[PDB]
Amino acid sequence: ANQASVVANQLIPINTALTLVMMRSEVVTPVGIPAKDIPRLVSMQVNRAVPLGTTLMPDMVKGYAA
User: In which region does residue 44 sit, left (phi positive, over 0), alpha (psi from -120 to 50) or beta (all else)?
Assistant: First the structure.
């Protein structure tokens, strides 16, 4: 309950490095990458285009391991 996840604040294009303006925090279901990880996600790349409002999941970020 109340676990916030990283949500795409903009459509994030494939193979583009994550910046702070692309990531917001929201309580969504299912749970994705924890919102506390937003700083460590900066400059990592997604391996697929992530539409606006999509929860970022571990498998979408290249190099992400919690």
Answer: beta
What amino acid is encoded at 44 in this protein? M
- Tell me the residue type at 49: A
> Exposure string (b/e) for 40-64, b if CB count within 10 Å is 16 or more?
ebeeebbeeebeeebbbeeebbeeb
Reported as type and span, the H/E element at residue 26 is strand 23-26
Please give the method by which this entry was determined.
Answer: X-ray
Distance (Å) of CA 51 to CA 1, 13, 46, 66: 24, 8, 12, 23
- Structural resolution in Å: 1.6
Q: Which domains does the chain have, with CATH numbers?
A: 1-66 (3.90.1210.10)
Place of tokens 């994550």: 18
